[PDB]
Amino acid sequence: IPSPVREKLNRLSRNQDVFPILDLQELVICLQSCDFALATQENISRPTSDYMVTLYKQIIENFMGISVESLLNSSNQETGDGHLQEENENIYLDTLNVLVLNKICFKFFENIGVQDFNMTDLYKPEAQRTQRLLSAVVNYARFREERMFDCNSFILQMESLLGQINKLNDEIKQLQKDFEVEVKEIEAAYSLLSGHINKYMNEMLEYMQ
Amino acid sequence: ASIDAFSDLERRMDGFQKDVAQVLARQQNHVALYERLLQLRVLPGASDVHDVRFVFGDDSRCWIEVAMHGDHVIGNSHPALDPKSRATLEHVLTVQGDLAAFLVVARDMLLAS
Amino acid sequence: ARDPRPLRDKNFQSAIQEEIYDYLKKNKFDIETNHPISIKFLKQPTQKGFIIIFKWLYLRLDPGYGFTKSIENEIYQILKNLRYPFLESINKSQISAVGGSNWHKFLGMLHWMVRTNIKLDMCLNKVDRSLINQNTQEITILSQPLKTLDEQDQRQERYELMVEKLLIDYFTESYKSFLKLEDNYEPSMQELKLGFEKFVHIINTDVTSTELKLEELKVDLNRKRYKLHQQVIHVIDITSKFKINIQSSLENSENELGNVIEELRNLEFE
Amino acid sequence: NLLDNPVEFLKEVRESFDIQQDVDAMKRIRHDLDVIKEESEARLKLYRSLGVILDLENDQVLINRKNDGNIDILPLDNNLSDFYKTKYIWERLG
């Protein structure tokens, strides 16, 4: 008297894989069209480290709108830690940065259906994992592009309101520029005359002493 | 670019305007004036051997010419005068040697004649 | 490239075992895994218990990593990808039985991981604080009474940054529902509408602020111009009177002296 | 509310000065003083030697032909001078 089995806890694994896997040529065309010029079929098929590090940085800055430099900056708190004693060494640097980059990808991919991003994907990338991850990314980008018309009313309201600031700020800089020019050009007509008057009296004095 | 320093130039205007007034203070003729008050003018003589000619009155009614080079006693008069009037005037320039005395007396003789 | 720490020193091993045990008990090692922790165990360990500790620490550094069936064969590669600064100093032969004489080299690697974990939390706080800083972008420029920056439009680009931060939140959440075969994003949309009203109210502050500042520059320039104009009037008013009086003086002097010279040379009777 | 065009206004002031007119004027004024001075000089010493001294500082005329300063003065103000000043300036002489 045996009992059946629900294999499809792997449907949940397929569920973790709900986003579509894109063919190599289509995946790259879409990635390039998102203005990631660095992405190529050749490099992505044989991923190397220091290439993936550069390429990954470009991707994160676009979808997150942040500065990697600012990221390096925030890792190094200016004051408040360890200032009295150096402990004599520049070590831990970059190692912490490498794990922080790992975390950034991990959190993002959790949001788009990938739960197991890890250091191999960054530092010894492999073809199937690489295309799987990027296909989830593209599907997310397409969803964002596709659904971007949901927010156009907000954009239009924002553009109206931003227009009022700019129009008001344009008037302010125009008015403040025009008055300073007007003042000086009148003063030039007077400044010429002021030198003229000292000159006139000085010549007349030549024949009075 | 000049401004606000006008008080410096204002001082120059007020100073120069009044330096002008000092230099241009109206010098009086002192000769047109003296002739106007006294009806007495000093002109060169017609006969330049006798240098100085004196004209009395508003018109050419009375006049006389005198050398005034040294001991100047020259007889000459538009209203003719007797020798006695001419001798007294000739002594004031000779035995008195006073120009001022000779001048006041001469005009009295001429205007009355 | 060798590790400068004195791993072989036996005094150091005795000291840190007590210090390590206290930390391990506090962070629930003996509870999360059934394996108990003891000073004796940290004195000389078993290989089985070491892998439990290494995996527990590394998952705190790299939670998505999928460990293979025999962790010993990827520890070197893991350190290589991690850019472990002391990789050359660890020989591949002693990973087979770490509990032997060379346990000190592997205690120090584990200890270094603890220090990295400690430092990572500080890093995450700075990232979090950076999030706080991004929480500043939203609120720090707007709480300037008035800002100082080369582009009044840069405040604006910051405003756009403040706005864009809302859509990334909005679309990120909507995408989660889409992948769950869900299509209703009204929860996300209502939250976006409420946040945008805050924006409208706050950017309204700039419109109202800028309008009032603008009306004050108008009044001030008109009055300053009037004051400056009065300065011009005074110069022009007394300059002309100066010149005309001297023109009169010049004219008066010339007529004065011309008539005198005519009289001085008019020796006629007339 | 004022200064319809301050730029033209200032221009007129520079154009109303004219240096050469006044410089030319200065040449003529200095020349005229010399002509009056030089052609009055010989006569002016003759009138000075007469004893007739003139005060224009204080609007009166002094006479010093009696070896004293007690000779009565004649003011220059509020006067006819129409055979008026001349009578006084002939009766005070001797």
Author numbering:
A (entry chain B): 48 to 64, 1007 to 1153, 1407 to 1451
B (entry chain D): 2 to 31, 138 to 220
C (entry chain A): 113 to 318, 621 to 684
D (entry chain C): 6 to 48, 162 to 212
Paper's wording?
We generated a chimeric construct that fused to the N-terminus of Ndc80cdwarf Nuf2 a peptide containing Ipl1 residues 26–59, with 40–44 (a disordered loop in the AF2 prediction) deleted. The chimera crystallized in space group P43212 (a = b = 115Å, c = 424Å), with two complexes in the asymmetric unit related by an approximate non-crystallographic dyad. We recorded anisotropic diffraction data to a minimum Bragg spacing of 3.9Å, but intensities of reflections in the a* and b* directions fell below significance at Bragg spacings of ~6 Å. When phased only on the molecular-replacement model, a difference map showed strong density for ordered parts of the Ipl1 segment and a structure overall that was consistent with the AF2 prediction between Ipl1 residues 48 and 56. The density for this segment was continuous with that for the Nuf2 subunit of the non-crystallographic-symmetry related complex. Thus, the asymmetric unit is a “domain-swapped” dimer, and the interactions may have been essential for the crystals to form, suggesting that the interaction might occur in solution. Although both sequence alignment and AF2 prediction suggest a potential first part of a bipartite motif, the density map was not continuous enough in the predicted region to build any structure with confidence. The refined conformation of the peptide between residues 50 and 56 (or 76 and 82) is very similar to that of the Mps1 motif, and hence also to the Dam1 peptide, even though the starting point for fitting the peptide was independent of the Mps1 and Dam1 structures. The second-part binding motif, SKIPSP(V/I)R, is present with some variation, in Ipl1/AuroraB from other point-centromere yeast. The Ipl1 peptide bound more weakly than those from Dam1 and Mps1, but avidity contributed by the two copies of the conserved motif might enhance binding of the intact protein.
Ndc80c, a heterotetramer of Ndc80, Nuf2, Spc24, and Spc25, is a 600 Å long rod, largely two-chain coiled-coil, with an Ndc80/Nuf2 globular “head” at one end and an Spc24/Spc25 globular knob at the other. The Mps1 and Aurora B kinases regulate and monitor kinetochore attachment to spindle microtubules during cell division, ultimately ensuring accurate chromosome segregation. We show here, biochemically and structurally, that short peptide segments on both Mps1 and Ipl1 bind the site on the Ndc80/Nuf2 head of Ndc80c that we have shown previously to bind an Ipl1-phosphoregulated peptide segment near the C-terminus of Dam147. The Ndc80c head is thus a communication hub for ensuring a robust linkage between centromere and spindle and for integrating the SAC with tension sensing and error correction.
